[PDB]
């Protein structure tokens, strides 16, 4: 998504996303969720269980 | 508020001739109000003529003088042209540039272009 | 032309006199009356709107009225530049257009 | 228009404020408003 390559199960997101808002980061900077650049649809970015 | 400029200047028009008259503008813009004519001869009283009508949203012409005079009008340059046609007698008289609200409610002549004689 | 007002009309200076011009239904009934103001060669001056306005610049001596189909122009305080001639308009739905009566010449004596 | 050019019609009153770079704290709802910010420059708490 936007250039970014990470692996993870691909989920919808309950947290509502602003139209400005296109991602979602922790503050260790890993992106928990991103919005889908085809659609506005929000999705939760959850790595694979490990 | 605003000053009026001159109906058409002095126009003069031998018998077989027919006369346009620009009145234009100052201080105001010309489609945000309406103007008007009155026939005025020397000695004599009052005849409106041509004019904008507030309601509709038409020109009027004055019934009796109806399709011999015409007018039109350019929004940019203000310039309202007043064509009467087909010379007659008693048909040279000053003509009178008069103003009125196009927001209606406004019979009153307002501001005058000082009047122009024309000639049969 | 199709209203009532005569040719002149004469007082002393400095009185009290008015002009009256009488209309009908069709024309002054329901609508508003105004009235203007012409020097000799000169340009026609609006005097009154509605009957009770005032345009800028006019001394507020000049009022009016109007009582059914009939309208005075109120005038007041004669002044040796006063005399004139007068002219009642009203809006016309009869032609639908605008009418003024012949005009009426003052004069201050 | 003639009443018993115009301009200036009506009143206007506008606030204007200049941002100055500050460090604020800011608190994240679930929705992701920022329901509360602090400036530490402000004061010592």
């Known amino acids: 998504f936007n250039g970014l390559t990470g692996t993870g199960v691909l989920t919808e997101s309950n947290k509502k996303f602003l139209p400005f808002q ?29 | ?24 503008v100052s201080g105001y813009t010309l489609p945000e109000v309406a103007m008007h004519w009155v026939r005025q001869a020397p000695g004599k009283g009052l005849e409106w003529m041509g004019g904008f009508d507030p309601e509709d949203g038409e020109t009027m012409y004055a019934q009796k003088f109806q399709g011999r005079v015409t007018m039109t009008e350019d929004t940019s340059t203000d310039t309202a042209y007043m064509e009467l046609s087909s010379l007659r007698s008693e048909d040279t008289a000053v003509y009178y540039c008069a103003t009125t609200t196009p927001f209606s409610s406004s019979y009153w002549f307002d501001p005058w272009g000082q009047g122009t004689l024309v000639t049969v | ?45 609006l ?45 016309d739905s009869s032609l639908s257009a605008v009418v003024f009566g012949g005009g009426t010449k003052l004069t201050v004596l | 228009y003639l009443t018993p050019s115009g301009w200036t019609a009506g009143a206007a009153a506008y606030y204007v404020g200049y941002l100055q770079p500050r460090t604020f704290l800011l608190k994240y709802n679930e929705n992701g408003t920022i329901t509360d910010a602090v400036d530490c420059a402000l004061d010592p708490l």
């Open chain 1, 22 to 50: 296109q991602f979602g980061r922790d503050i260790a900077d890993t992106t928990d969720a991103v919005r889908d650049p085809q659609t506005l649809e929000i999705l939760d970015i959850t790595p694979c269980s490990f």
């Open chain 2, 1 to 24: 508020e605003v000053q009026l400029l001159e109906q058409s200047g002095a126009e003069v028009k031998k018998p077989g001739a027919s006369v346009r008259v620009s009145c234009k």
């Open chain 3, 1 to 45: 032309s199709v209203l009532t007002q005569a040719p002149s009309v004469s007082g002393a200076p400095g009185q009290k006199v008015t002009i009256s011009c009488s209309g009908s239904s069709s024309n002054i009934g329901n609508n508003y009356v105004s009235w203007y103001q012409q020097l000799p060669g000169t340009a026609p001056k």
């Open chain 3, 47 to 91: 005097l009154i709107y509605d009957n009770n306005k005032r345009p800028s610049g006019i001394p507020d001596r000049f009022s009016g009225s109007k009582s059914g189909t009939s309208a005075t122009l109120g005038i007041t305080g004669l002044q040796t530049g006063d005399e004139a001639d007068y002219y009642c308009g009203t809006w």
